[PDB]
Design a protein around this ligand. Structure first.
Ligand SMILES: Nc1ncnc2c1ncn2[C@@H]1O[C@H](CSCC[C@H](N)C(=O)O)[C@@H](O)[C@H]1O
Length: 377
């Protein structure tokens, strides 16, 4: 079976670089592209990368790439790949759904069906079985994906399963977990600094900051597809999980608070915090952000406030942003990080940003406004 893998971590536009940095911290060279970061590794790499990456979406094996303008070229291309190095006899290997962009092969159901038929044939042939009798599929799942871009096909295996943002703590339009993590990793927060989310919604920022502060692995309370693969060493998975549990630091004292003026959200956030066992670590309450005051210095504030041109009328959004500036103005020593689609945020907030980074929250373009705190001399 396959020992060296070509791998991709998929990531939302604007945070590929955060995924790159995370991979480098795991000891991995990588190539950052649009929506994806390429790397290589062994099976232990697959485990560690699923377990540890806070900002990526999925980890996938690239089985192979080839040109395909006709369905016969597609069939032969897929047939030619070394499925025998990945798929044991009797395993399930569903394909897809498929994707095609700017390609003569445009019918996604047909791409999906042809791909499945070619793999079946390759395995029937490799396992010396008659090619006219269906293979048994009682085994573990290997999820197959195929994608066509300008008549170039790419065939992958999903090692992850449910997307990585599903850490397992979400009980209830939350920002995605891996995105909130990416924004924390782009911030200048460190465990010894107070952290506040003044528009906390379902508690995502607070919870991701806690896990980072205690060095709890993103995937600590969840499973991954590759773990069910028969040829993956039980002893390896156990060792990788053990090392991770050991690297955690449940002792660190953190100061993490979040609040929201909607009681329904606070109720959701408390349940979510409790789901990861952080109920005594994250401080959550119902409060208007306009009432926030602190005498603590050198904190980090991170907020994903109501966006403009959506649920809230312009006049109210502008007032909200005006009041945020008024409220946060006295936090001279704190860094502040604000995510919104409002390109006039700065004027409304009343302060010019020290840095801006363009991100995507789903399909929606949003900018991260970064305001750095200053120590008083
Ligand atoms: N004046 C105010 N004070 C505190 N929170 C407010 C507020 N006005 C709106 N909010 C809250 O700001 C949030 C913006 S949506 C943020 C959702 C969050 N990032 C998540 O992942 O769950 C909403 O939950 C809304 O109730």
């Amino acid at each position: 079976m396959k020992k060296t893998f070509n791998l991709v971590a998929t990531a939302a536009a604007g945070i590929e670089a955060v995924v790159g940095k995370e991979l480098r911290n795991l000891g991995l060279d990588c190539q950052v592209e649009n929506g994806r970061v390429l790397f290589k590794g062994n099976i232990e790499t697959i485990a560690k990368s699923n377990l540890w990456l806070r900002s990526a979406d999925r980890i996938k094996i690239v089985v192979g790439e080839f040109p395909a303008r006709t369905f016969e070229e597609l069939f032969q291309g897929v047939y030619a790949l070394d499925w025998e190095n990945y798929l044991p006899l009797g395993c399930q290997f569903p394909v897809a759904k498929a994707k095609s962009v700017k390609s003569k092969l445009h019918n996604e159901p047909s791409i999906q069906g042809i791909t499945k038929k070619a793999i079946v044939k390759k395995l029937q042939h490799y396992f010396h079985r008659p090619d006219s009798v269906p293979l048994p599929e009682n085994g573990p799942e290997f999820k197959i994906e195929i994608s066509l871009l300008k008549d170039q096909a790419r065939v992958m295996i999903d090692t992850t399963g449910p997307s990585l943002f599903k850490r397992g703590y979400r009980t209830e339009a939350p920002i995605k977990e891996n995105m909130a993590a990416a924004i924390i990793l782009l911030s200048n927060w460190f465990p010894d600094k107070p952290f506040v989310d003044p528009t906390c919604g379902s508690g995502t920022f607070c919870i991701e900051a806690a896990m980072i502060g205690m060095n709890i692995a993103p995937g600590f309370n969840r499973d991954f597809a590759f773990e069910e693969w028969p040829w993956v060493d039980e002893a390896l998975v156990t060792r990788v999980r053990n090392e991770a549990d050991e690297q955690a630091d449940y002792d660190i004292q953190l100061d993490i608070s979040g609040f929201d003026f909607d009681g329904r959200m606070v109720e959701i956030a408390r349940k979510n915090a409790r789901e990861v066992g952080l109920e005594d670590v994250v401080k959550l309450k119902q409060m208007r952000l306009q009432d926030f005051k602190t005498n603590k210095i050198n904190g980090v504030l991170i907020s994903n406030p109501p966006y403009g041109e959506r649920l809230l009328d312009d006049k109210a959004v502008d007032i909200l942003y005006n009041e945020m500036g008024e409220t946060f103005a006295p936090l001279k020593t704190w860094s502040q990080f604000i995510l919104t689609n409002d390109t006039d945020f700065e004027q409304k907030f009343g302060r010019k940003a020290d840095k801006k980074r363009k991100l995507y929250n789903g399909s929606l373009k949003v900018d991260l406004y970064q305001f750095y705190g200053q120590r008083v001399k």
